Each structure stands twice: as structure tokens, then as C-alpha cells.
Design a protein around this ligand. Sequence first.
Ligand SMILES: [Mg+2]
Ligand SMILES: [Zn+2]
Lengths: 14, 110, 94, 56, 1111, 221, 147, 170, 55
Amino acid sequence: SDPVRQYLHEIGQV
Amino acid sequence: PVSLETPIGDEKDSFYGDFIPDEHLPSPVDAATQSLLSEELEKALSKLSEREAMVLKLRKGLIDGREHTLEEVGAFFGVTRERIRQIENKALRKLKYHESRTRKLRDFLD
Amino acid sequence: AEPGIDKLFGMVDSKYRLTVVVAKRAQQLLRHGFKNTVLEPEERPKMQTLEGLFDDPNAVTWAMKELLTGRLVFGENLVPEDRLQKEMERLYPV
Amino acid sequence: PQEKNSLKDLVYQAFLRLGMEKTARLLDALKYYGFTFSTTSGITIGIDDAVIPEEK
Amino acid sequence: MEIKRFGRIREVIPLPPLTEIQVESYRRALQADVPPEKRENVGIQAAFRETFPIEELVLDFLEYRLGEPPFPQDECREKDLTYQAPLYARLQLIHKDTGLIKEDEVFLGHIPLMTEDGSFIINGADRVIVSQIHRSPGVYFTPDPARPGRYIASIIPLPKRGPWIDLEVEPNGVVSMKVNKRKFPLVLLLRVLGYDQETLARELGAYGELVQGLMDESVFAMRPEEALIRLFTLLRPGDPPKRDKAVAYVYGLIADPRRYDLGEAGRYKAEEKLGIRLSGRTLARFEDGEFKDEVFLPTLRYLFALTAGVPGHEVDDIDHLGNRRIRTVGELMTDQFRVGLARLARGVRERMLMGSEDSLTPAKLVNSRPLEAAIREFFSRSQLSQFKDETNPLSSLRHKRRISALGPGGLTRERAGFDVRDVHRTHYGRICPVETPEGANIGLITSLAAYARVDELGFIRTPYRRVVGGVVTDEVVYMTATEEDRYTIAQANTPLEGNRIAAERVVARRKGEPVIVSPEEVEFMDVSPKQVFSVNTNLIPFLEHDDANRALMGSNMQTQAVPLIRAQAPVVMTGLEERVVRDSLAALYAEEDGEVAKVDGNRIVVRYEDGRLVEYPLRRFYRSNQGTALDQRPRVVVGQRVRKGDLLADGPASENGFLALGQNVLVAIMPFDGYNFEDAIVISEELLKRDFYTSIHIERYEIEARDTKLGPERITRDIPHLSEAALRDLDEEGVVRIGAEVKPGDILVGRTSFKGESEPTPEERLLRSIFGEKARDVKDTSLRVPPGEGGIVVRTVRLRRGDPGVELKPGVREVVRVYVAQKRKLQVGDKLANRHGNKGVVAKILPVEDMPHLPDGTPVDVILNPLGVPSRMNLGQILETHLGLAGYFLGQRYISPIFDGAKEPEIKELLAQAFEVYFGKRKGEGFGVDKREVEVLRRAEKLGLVTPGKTPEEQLKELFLQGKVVLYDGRTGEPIEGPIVVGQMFIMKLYHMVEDKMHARSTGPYSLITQQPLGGKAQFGGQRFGEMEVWALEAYGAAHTLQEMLTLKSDDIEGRNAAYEAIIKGEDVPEPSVPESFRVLVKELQALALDVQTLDEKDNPVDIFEGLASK
Amino acid sequence: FNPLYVMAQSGARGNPQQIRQLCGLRGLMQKPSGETFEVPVRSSFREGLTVLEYFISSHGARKGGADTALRTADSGYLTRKLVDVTHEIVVREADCGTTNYISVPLFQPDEVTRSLRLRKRADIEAGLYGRVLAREVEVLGVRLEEGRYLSMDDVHLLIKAAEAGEIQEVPVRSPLTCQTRYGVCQKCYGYDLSMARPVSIGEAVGIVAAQSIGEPGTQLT
Amino acid sequence: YRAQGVKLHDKHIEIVVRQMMKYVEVTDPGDSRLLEGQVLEKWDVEALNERLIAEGKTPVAWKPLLMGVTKSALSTKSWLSAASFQNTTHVLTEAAIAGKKDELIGLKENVILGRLIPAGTGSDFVRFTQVVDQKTLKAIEEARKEA
Amino acid sequence: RVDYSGRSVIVVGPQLKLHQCGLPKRMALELFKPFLLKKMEEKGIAPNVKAARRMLERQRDIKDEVWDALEEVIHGKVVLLNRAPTLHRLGIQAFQPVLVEGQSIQLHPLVCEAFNADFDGDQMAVHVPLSSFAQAEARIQMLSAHNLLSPASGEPLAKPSRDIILGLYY
Amino acid sequence: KEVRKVRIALASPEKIRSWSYGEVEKPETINYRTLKPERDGLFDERIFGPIKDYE
DNA sequence: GCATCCGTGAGTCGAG
DNA sequence: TATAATGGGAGCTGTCACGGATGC
Ligand SMILES: [Mg+2]
Ligand SMILES: [Zn+2]
């Protein structure tokens, strides 16, 4: 629900 | 710039944009005035001859929206540019006279 | 209360029809400059000026009074609209 | 004695029998005389006009 | 004249400084007069101490100072300036590595100063910051609505200073904690705090079945670190559980004094409720690397003890005034200061990274813009910051004492049910039960009681006298509601001989409950009845005789009273009318004993004992926020000996130092020809003749001349196409001359604007050709007097660009202000009211000969309908009228205190003494009883008013003692058929005046998008014909009228134009067209990707845009 | 001829409870909880209250004001709902032709006596007045024809007949049973109550219904 | 209302109640296209069923439904009426999906359009009524006789 | 929001007939302004409409003949009075205006109940129905004297009250 | 013709493109100096029409 | 079937 | 245009009742 949190999570997968 | 939706008051009931007038679209009064002006102009132009009213209408753009040169109005009536300048000047002379007499078009001078 | 309002409501099946008849009649009177009136010179509605009695400018008052006389005919489909307008413009030019 | 209810009834019956225009006239008349008499009647309120019953 | 005061109640203490709730609060907040080293950590000081040191290089706070204001108050009001002081802070930058120290005093901007009277001047306008009531922080226990045998524990910090935490015992038996809408087992958090199964077992074991519900094996198995990471994964899912991140987050949520602040009041309430001591304002601590519990275990313990039904444990009443506190000016302002400071700190930390890590001063590190912005935002745009109400001095005095439950960090209006709007028993002596707004805000906006003061913690306290044995001391104790609940408090009117209680049975309160009690059981006693009510309510005489609903209106309406040129204090006062004027600061008094050297309209010079010569300038014809005139008049003469505290000048709405909100008029209570109908009021033309109810009002007009891309606007006397008649009262520069009378349509300031580029229509070409006159470059933009306004020009202010001391907003060459004044006589539609809630509009002004009159020829002033009394149940006005009659003839005024007043017998006595003067005079003058007086006496004994058989004089006196007299109808000469109540009543002219409210519009300005008329008199607006109005027209079946409202009279453009032209041509109005707002609706639905199609009967598209919107 | 008494009796102003507060005792007051105080207010406004009594009264005053304030929004909202639901209903014709109708009961079963008793006058008038008769009705030797709008007199006659045991209920045309599409018809509607006569075709009847139900809303306690 | 001393005719409450009972729910579709549990106006199912039973088809079995004034108002055939009431997005999404056509039957629709409402002087019953004076009337009559 | 509308404080007008209201002249001059311009043209008060309007713009340029003209304009016409909240259809009624000096609208006592109007400072709005049709609707359907009974109960709405009752009873 | 009905329906991207007089390619509103609308922006005269009549 | 969560509503006109 | 620099930050608490989808 929080686009920032989502994006940070995606970033953290690399 | 500032938001038209900027709130006025502590109630949610009013916006800033609500206090801003429209200066673009003519008011009922202004529209009325312009109409009356056209009608008084036609009334005054009817006191001329058809030809000398037509010369003025053609020269000032009341017809077709464009202001015709003396050479064009003259060529349109089959007369000389000097002839048309002359009938335009005597037309305008009669207009000014009828104006001094009836005082009709004065109030539209603002 | 409008004078003879009860009798006027008497003349109609629906009060709104009274309103329509009155309104349209007043439009007729205004359009033809009252010279189409069914009233007689002593029946003409009057208005008190500083000068004195003059014709009542109000067409709705006129129309209601006219209606009260009985000399007006109202209903649906009495005559084609164009024909009515033209016959009226022939009888009372503008 | 004429009071709210009787006067209301009067108005209604007058509406039925005499119609709108006359009832309007009746209403204006009732208004006029009512006011007129109300002023000369000598109705007022002093503190002694609220009367404590001995029974209290 | 003589002033006779009633009542036996002796008040041991005077009313407190009335604006002290404002003044002391702000004084404490700024600590300006305290030398920096001696400052307590509170207010601004506390904000700095909280924000600093800023760690990351380390920036630390030393001390702050406040300078003097750049401009005085009068100047600020004149120039649209905020009255304020420069704030500086001495900061030292330290490099912990190097040891290096750079220290400097940085300028943080300005902070607004409170004036002497407790108000502010913010951008030229006077404002009040209203105190805000709210729930006190602390730890509360409320019953759980779902499960009866269970409870909810709520931990509440200060607003914006933390999340609330709720402790609950779930149906499954496990104890849950709710934070930021997430719930978890409280046991986990306890484990993070370092609790072990042994400690919890020994501690909470006494309450049998719950502790096992607290027991969770897995949690006790894992050490506090694993529990901290686990808790963090519960609170912040998806965030990788780095241990330092977890420590930081939990600390920030719970133990961080920067992010979590219980009140000082929060702390005190917690300590008091749970019986513990807090090391600080946080729920836990971070000490020696781990977390240490503070709050949670005592609250859990109390919760369990309560559920178990252990004696000594109670639920909390959240509307109890022990649990509800006031946030005053200082606290609110300080909050915003703290916010701006935290932002400034964010900026500092960011600057401590970029740039050179070596060369930095404190001046380079600090940007004060966020702080300035937070404060400017609070004072300008907050809801609690209000345009001051200064209609009359009492208006502002009351405004400053108001208490709001609304505003930021508080209730919305839907959030307010019955519970909050209620009068709590604890409101006694603290918040007035009477003075609150009628309507939607009822119970939300309230007023501080007269003897009440807000303590340092923010709880309202009320004074009581100690009673030892049966003896009442003079020692007063201010108590909060919570402490008040402990004692048995006797009523203030309980009989006394000396200091001893003289009654065998006394009326007292125990926890608000009324009770009959022995003098031995009396611990305290009320100071006065005045302490129960607000300042406005305390100004209503015979209040005990007025129903509360009407008394409310009386209170509120005194606020609306307009200062009158002839204004007088009431003939019946309550004894507060002097104090109010004094505290208001409107009236002027002498500092020490002395002699008056000079007396002028403009100033008073006094030579004191000191020998020093002090000059007091007087404010003359100044315009208040509401446009009433504030002006001071000298009450002393040259060479007069004055003492300390003696009156020098009267302020507005005061007479010889007494509050004058109105006039004393001779009133008759009786119907008059229906002009009295339904609260309407009839008055005598004599009132206008003698200038009673006449008031001065000043309106301010303003105009700017600015730079345009088309060339400069100019303020000039040269205005295109205008007659000398039109320009007559304008000076060389184009500004109207002082002293000129201006009427609607008249020019105030002449201005020209460069005409926007346009091609003249061929019609204008022909016209211009006919008259041979060039169309001017400029248009007439002049400021004119609006419809219904106008008066005498009393002032002009002009401010140009390039002249000393003045700078305008960008683009603005010059600003002109014109002040226009008017003397307003009372007229039909103006509103009058008394202090008892009787209010009405003036419907008729009769010539004096039509006015009802006394036998001796004296006509009455006002005629009030008796029908207004019985349903309203306000009898105070009646008693006021009677005592006013007595006073009218005896030539005296009275002070009848609230609830200890003049009673009926005394009023009868005064009335008798009055009758002697009213009659005996006549008998001596050689006149006997009138024939008509005899007739009236006949009808009167028929009414049982007089005793039959007594002499006419005896009977007339019997009537006069009932406050009734014989009254003659000025029209007939015949008497009114019965004796009528006549006397002096105090009546005020309120701020609602027909002149201000009357408005009409034919055509006018329209809105941009909707093309519908604008709103309001000020915009020349049209009336709103709303949904309900439309319903009315529909129910009448009036279709064409309704259609007119929807089209020709609103947003149908073609239609309204055509209608105007038709009406001025005498033609009937045209058939209406499509309303522009429907086209707007269609395009707005197209913007939403919905296709809206108007169709004909054949289901073919109809184009209402007439080809204009289609390609 | 006392002024309070005269005003009260005439209906010019005042009602008994208000007069009771003036000359009588003020009476019992209620706590904020709604629970009543044991001690009443013995004083009357003529005598004047005691600060404790006055304060005790304020709770109820305030509760009343809050009641009102919060009620006007609820009534308003209701009215708007009613308008939105009934707005299309108009008298669109003279007779829909239905044979259906409703029988207005003149007797309510009484619970305490467990037997029928006569409904109150005004209730019957509210259910009867200005309605078209569904079937012919003969009572007390008078023939009320089918299709007759009931005058207030007609209603009084039916009530007197009911007292004489002649008739226990009245067949009547109603909007409930009306078959008119998008509205009602003149007959099923009846009197336009404001004119005491048959409603005119075209009257927007739904709006009037909503306004009629909605207007008193702020007075309901 | 009676308890508050408010005299109000049953008639009005009946108009409202009538609108409350306006709708029905299908128990069995019969030979129609309708679905079981589907809700529709009583008028429409009566017309449909008389169209089916006169066609020799099994009629729809339906049940009376009572819905409150809010729901009833929101369920009306007119989408301008419903969307101006409340729940504008819901009303408008379903209306827009369905390709719904507002027939401008009631008052609100016409008011929104700035039209002449179908009540009072706008009613089709009294709307077209003509007035003519006897002189012009007879003149026209002679004119129509001579053709 | 609509044109040809206005608002002011209301005052009792006992002397009024049931079909009348007091309407302040200054309000009337604005509300009827276009009609007034036309009439000012018919009578010689102004050369034309533009001059008439220019003449009404300044309050000191207003002579007494325009008031007589305005009296002529409003003849037989009615205005709508409205008071908020408009709870039922009698929240709006039609009255024939009687021009009055002074800034207050004068309201007839008998209609106070239907408007729930009183004299404690209530204000009302005025509207001018423009067309022959609207004016007809107002005079016939909406006129105060023509609606005497409650559309709700059928009982009399405009009826004696307060002072009137008091006097008659006395 | 007279309007007897109002239809409301979903709009294809095709219909939305048929309504459109141009594509707004730029976040620009009006020019900071001239105050005239910026080309291809939200106020563009080439898209939504001329600011002044017949000019 | 019955808890439960989410979304949607909550009087009018005036002024500001 | 090049030292190295590698996962955010502010939360908002005193309604209240209903319709309707969704969940064990
Ligand atoms: Mg009022
Ligand atoms: Zn029917």
C-alpha cells in the first residue's frame, strides 16, 4: 500500500 | 500561483475561487448596450441615401468586417476614388448634422 | 386575494390551467398592445398616477378580468398555431 | 370566549362557506380588531402577576 | 447620584486579573524578563533544550535573547506589521574530534509579542489566541463497551507527542497492546524491557487467572534482543530487521524524549494514578545499552487489579475536569515553535554533511526559515488564532477568556456527541454553565468562570474558603476538580454571625452531590455565587429569576452591544461593571497620586507626587475590527487632585469608569397595535431627538496602483470622460478631501489603468468617425463608494514607492487608504436587547404624541410586548423594570448582586418612597385624582389589584407597589383600561443593523467556471436559491418561475442577456436556453471518460455545444 | 383576568408547565447521565433560584440545546431523503381506473381492556378527510355515494355512525392502491388539503408529501 | 407525530410508503430473461408477465420487497436523479456500464437540465391549452369555413 | 445563486393586507432596475436607457420622478419572499409589494407562522418573477392570500395568534 | 431538435481521441514572461481555442 | 450462518 | 563530468450507524 516501501523492497532484492 | 480551491473560513463551506468575477464574458448590460448601438447606428444610416450609407458601411467595416480603401469602394460603385471620397465626406457631413439635431448617438460615446 | 379568484378556479378543471390561460392571454395583450382586448372602455383596469387615472400597464390583471367577463374562449386544439398568429396579426397589426 | 381553537374553526368554516377572498378579508379584520383591542385592554406583566398559591 | 447596593455576602477576595489566562501564560512562555542563566526549562527555553544539541560535528545551544520591538503597536496597526521582538540564539559549534569551538549568536527571526491586554497584532489586525480544552495526558482506565467484566487501559501523551497505547485483555486470555493500529502480545514488549517469568509471576500473581494469560513460553525462552528483533518485525513488516534499526525504532516509539512526550501534567497524572514516580516523560528508558521499563508494568498491574475488583481501584471519568485540561496561548505557540525548531534542526543535520566538513560557523549551519514559517503559520492561519472581537471592551475581554474544544489536536464537530457538550458537575466554579453558543457549537465553545484560574499544569482551579470547626477563615485555597472531590463544601449564602456558621443545617456539596450537613462537617465554603458564572453572565442582574436558556442569550448579546455616543451604565448593576472596564484597558487611570496639569480632547497631562510630568495621549475616533469607534474622553479637569487608580479618561462604552453597553430607557410593558408583534419593538422618536442609541462607525477603503505589462496604474485627479461635478471633492492628487460627504457612486480615490489592447468594433470606428474624438489610452478604474455606504471622510493614508520608510509588495507603486465615518441613528430594523435575553428589532418609531404617557405628561421611551415574557421565563427584566421605576423617581441607581440581591420587600419599600415623590408632589401642586384614574381604579379593583374601599391615593399606591401605573393613550387621551407596568430598563443596540444587511441585485458579477452570480453583499452577489427553495417552487407547481431561477436568472448566458435586453425594450422575456453549468457537467464527465449524450425522441444525438466542441 | 392565566388559556402564549415554573415550583432536574436528582428545585422564577439549584438546572438546559442542534441535521437529512424518493410522483390523470382500495379502521383493539375501542377524533380525521369513497356507504339514513370526496362533516357523520355501531371501517381510495404510472391520480389522492377540494391534475404531490412529513421533524422529542 | 401533537394526513406517509414498496425480487424467471434473485420495479415485472402470459409463455414468479427510502431512491430508473442524490461514483459507474438512458420523467432530472418540470403549469395536461377571444375566434372560423 | 434577488431584515407590518409586504424603495429600484430604465425612457426622465442607467448609478443624481416611475413599474406585480430554512412550500410566498422608505422588509403578521418568522432579527430574501408566466404563477398559485390551509393537515395555516387572539379573547 | 433523453456510457479510447482537439505533450501552463499560453501545454491555444474572439 | 472491515453518509440562509 | 558515497519518514488517536463484501 506504500509505494516507497514497495520500491525499497524491490531495490533490496538486487 | 495560488489555488482557486484555497479554503475561506473554518467551515469547508467556501472557496477562494467563489469570490473571483469573470471579466471576460460580456455582462448582460454590455451586450445590451452594443446591440442598442448597432440599432441606433442603422437608424442614423437610414437617414442617408443607400449609396452614401453603403460607402460608410463599406469603409468602416460594418459590412464584411474589413475596412475597404477608397479605391475599392470607388471601384465598387463605378465611380472615381475622388468621387467616392466626396460622397463619403458629404455622407459623414449629413451624419454629423443629424447628430447635432437628434443628440442620439452621444450617450454611446461613454 | 385576487378579485374573483374563487370563480376563476371555478372555470377550470386544474388551477394550473387557469395559470396557463391567464399567462398566454397576457402575452397576447402585450404583443398586440392591448388593442385586442375583450374589455369595454369602462371595464378597462385603471392605475392612479400623479396625473390621474391611466390604463393599468399590468397585462396579467387585464387578462384575469377579461377571463371573468366570459368573452374569452379557452381549450386545447381550438386552432392551428400559425393560423391563429396570422389571423391575429391581420386583425391587430403590430 | 374566542381563543385559538374557536378562531381556527371560524377561519376554516369561513373558508368552506365563503371562499378564499372573503376569508382573507375576515382574517385581515380579525387581525385589525384583535390588535386594536389588545393594546387598550391593559394586559401587562408585573412580578406580582405570577401568583404563588397558598397551597404550595 | 446616590448608588444603593444590596446583599449581605462578603467576598474575602476580589476577582483575579481577568485576562491573566492570556498574559501570565505568554509571560511564562517567553521568559523575556528573566536573565538567561536564571531561566527554567519551560516554554521557548524548553523547546531549545529539546532540539539541541544537534548531534549528526556537534551544534549546541547556549542561551537565547529577545530584543525590543522595531515598531510600536500603533505603528504596526497603521503599517500592516506584526508586533514582535527579534529572537537571537547563542550557539556553539564543536568538533568533538578536533576540540575546535566556533561560537556565534544567530538571528532566528521575530516572535510576536502580546500587548498589555492579552492580544496580538498580526499583519496589522488584532488577534486573540483562544485557549484549547482537551483530554489531559496520563494513564486512564475505561470500561470495555463490548465485554462488561473487562476494561481498557489507555496511555495518552501530549498531542503530536506520541501514539496512544491501549492495553487490553483479549477473550483468549492473552494481554494485547495496540499501537499505531497494530496489536501484539504485551508480553513480547515486556521481554524487550527485560522482564522474566519469575518477576512477572511474583509481581502480578496476586490477581489469579490473568497472569497465566500473560505467560508465553516462546517469548520467555528468547533473550530481549531476539524479542526486540521479533517485535520490530511485528511493527514494521518488510523492513529488514537489522538490530540497530530495531533499537532505533523502538526507542523512538517509546523511550525517546524527543519523539515521545507525556505532559508534565501527563507525568503527574500517571504518578498519581498508578502510585509511582517517573524519572522522565517517557514510557521507558534506554540505559546502559538496554531498555528499562517505567510506565507499562504499573499500568498493567492497575488494569489487572481493577479487573479483579481490588479495593482502591477506579475507572476514570474522562470529562471530569481533573482529566480535562486547558492549553493556553503559551503552550500552543510553544508547540509550533518546537515544530519549526525540529525542522531547522533537520536542515542543520543536512548541512553538517555537504559543503566543507572543516570550515563551518553556526551562521552557515542554521536556516531560520522553517521556524519563522511555523510561527507565522500559527499566528496567521491557525483556527485558534482569531480576528479579535472588539465591538466593545467586554467583547475582547470575553474573547480572551473563551475555551474551545475545537481546533488542531482536538474535536471535529461530528466527533462531538452529548458527553463533551454536557455541563459536567466539575464545571462548577471553573467553566460557566450558561455562556456557550446557541446552535452547532453548543458545549464546544465555553467560557472561563469569573474566579477561575488555570494552573501551571493546565487544570482549571476555583477558590474555596477553609472552614475549621464552625469558623470560616479568610484563607482561600484554589482547588482542582480532583482535589475538590475530597471535601464537603458549603454554599456561599449559608448564614453567618461573624466568622461562625449560624445555621443548624447547611447546604453543601460532596463530589457535586447536594447534601444537608452539620457545621462540624463543613471543610470548605464557596467564595461567592459569582464564581459559578462567566464574566458576561455575572453582569445580568436578577439572574436567579431568569431561565438559563434566556440568560445564555443575555450573556452572548452583551458581546454584541455597540458603543454609543451617549452611553450610560445601567440603573440596576451587579457590581462588576467597574472591574470589567478597568481590566479591559480601554479606560485610562492615574498611576500615582497627583494633580492634573493639562486636559485636552487629545491628551491629559498629570503631575504626580514624584514631580515627574506624565503625558497620556488619548485614542480618538479609532476604528475597531468590527468598525465600531474606539475613542477615549477625558473625565478630569485642569488642576484636579487625583489619587492612585483614579479615573482620568473614559474608554468606549463606559461612563465614569462603569461599563456602559446601552441606555436606560423608560419602558412600558403592553401590546401596541401589533407593532409589538412577535418580539418586535416600538420606540419613541424622542430617542432619536436626544441622540440615544446613536453610534459612530468607521469603514476603511483601500486601493493599490501597480505596475502592469501594459503600463502603470496611476492615482490621479485626471479621469477620462468625467464632469467637474464628479471630481469636485478630489484634491490635486486624486484623493477625496478630508471632511467631504461621500454617497454611493462617489469617487474616493481616482485611478487610471492602461486599456488592454483591443480592436475597436466597426461600430466604434463609425462612432469615433462621427464625433471625431480619439479613444483615450486609459480607462477609469477609480475606487467608488459601494451601494448603501458612505459618510464623512475623516482620514486618508497614502503610501508611494520611493518615499522614505515605505516598501510595498512587488509590482505595487502606491497604496491609498480612505477612512469614512458615519453617525448612525437608531432606525427600523435595528436590533435591541436587554441583559435577560429579551431581544427584538425596531418595527415602528412613533412621534412623541402617539406614545403612551404618565398622567404628569411624561411619555414612555420603549414599548415591549408582555407576550415575550411567559414562554421565555425570564423574570429578571421585570424586577429590573420595577426597581428601575423606584430609581427613576428617587433619582438613584442600584447594585443588586447575582443571587444575593434586592428582594421583593426592599423593592416595594423603594417603590413606596418613589410613590411619595410621584404623587405627593402632585397633591401639593393643587391637583386631585383624575376622572380617568378613577375609572382605571374601578377596573383595577375588578381585577383584584387594589383593595376596595380605600382612597384613590391609597389604591394608586397599592398599584405602584406592584410596579404598575395609570397610563394614557396619546392618541385618544383615554387611559389604558388597566394599570400597566412601567419603569427604567437597560437596553443595548446590537451590532446587527439593517444598514449593513440590506442588499439587492438586478444583474452583476458571475463566477468563472459555473457562470452563476457571486455570493454576498460585498461582491454584489445574488441570493442562493437552494435545493429546498427549488422544492418549494416545485410544490407550488410553478414551473416557469423555477425555470427562470435555473436559467435566465443564473447561468444561461444567451438567456440572461436576451432577458435584460427584452426587459429594457419592453418586450416579454425570451424562452430560456441550456444552463451553462450543465455544459460544465457534461465536459467534466467527459474528463472522467464518460460519454454523456443528450438525445431527441428518435434517440439521435442533440448538440448542446452548437458545433463548437466538435471537429 | 390575570395576564399569565389569560395568555395561557387563550392560546396567545404560555403553557401550563411554564406557568408552573413561574408561580409554582421549578421541579425535578436531571443529571448529565439522565438520572434525576433526589432534591427538586423548590423555588420558582418569581422567588428566584439558589446558585446550586441554578447550576443543577443547567445540565438539562445544555442537554436540550445539544439535542436540538444534533436533531436539525437528522431531520434535514431525512427530508432530503424523502424528497429524493417521492419527487417524481405527480397527479398525472383523473382516474387510473383501479377497483382497489384501503379500509380505514374506526376502531383500535385496546390492549388493556382486550376489546375494541374508538380511535381518537383527529386520528380518524387524518385517515379520512378529503378522501374519495371506494364503495357506497349508507349510515344513519344518509347515502354517501361511491366517488364522493369526504368533507370534514362527512367524516364527523361517519364517526357518529360508528358511535352508533353502524359501521366499523371505511372503504377509501389511496395512493397505496393507485395504479397510475409515475404518480397518482386525482381520485386516489383526494383533496388538495390546502384548498379543501379535489386536487388539480399536475400538482406535484410527492414533494408536498416530503415537505409535510419533514417540516415537523425538528419538533419530535 | 401524534405524540408530538402534529396533525399530519396519512396520505403523505402513504405516498412515501408506496415508493418504499416499489420493487420486487424474482423467485423463478419463468420463460423470461430474468435471473433468480434479480431485483426490478413491480411495474416492469407486471408488464413483462402480462406480455409473457398473453404470448403463451410461463410468467415470472416474484416476491414483494421492502426497501428504505435511501435504497429506494438510489434504485430509481433515473440516473441523474440517483447520481444527484448520493453515492455518485457507484450510481454513475453502473449507469455508464449499462449505457443507461434518463427519460427525464421526474422533477430532479429536468431541474438539472434547466428544463420546464412535468408538474404544475408544466404538466402535459394543462400545458397546451389555448386562449382566444370571440372576435378572432369567429374570424378564424369563417376563414376555415371558406376553404 | 440568482439574479433579480435581494435580502434584508424583517419588521412587522400590521397595517398590511394579507397579500402585501413592505418593500424598501432602494431594494425595489435595484430589483426592478431594467423595467425602471424602460419606464424612465417612456416618460422623459432620460434620453435613453444608457443615460437612465448612468443617472441611477450616482445616488445624488436620483430625482423624485424616478420614484413615481418605479411605482408605475411595479404596478400589479408581485415578489417572492423566502425565509431559511425553507421546510415546506410556504417558506416561499408571493406578495404585492408596497414601496416603503427605510431599509426593512415589512412582513404581514398572519404569515409569520408558516415562515416560522419572527422579529428578533430574522432576515428574508426577495425574488422578482420576470415573465408574464412566472408572474401569473406567483399571483395565482403562490400568493399568500390564496394559501390559507396547511397542505399537510388541511387545517388553517394563516390564523389569529398572539396579540390578535389576546385582544379578541379580552 | 428537442432533448428528450440523456444517455451515459463508457468511452472507447477512440471516442476520447475523437473528442480531443490536440494532445497535451507538455506540463507547461503559461509563459513566465509573456503570460501567454505555452505551445503544447495545458493552456495551448492551438488545442483548446483562441483566448480572444475571432483573433 | 455471524463476526468483521471498509466505504459512505450526517439541515439552511447569511459572513469570511 | 571521476576521493567515496548504496533501503524513507511521519505517523494521529473523543463519532456512529448502515449496507454490503468478505472471512472461519
Ligand atoms: Mg428568530
Ligand atoms: Zn388511482
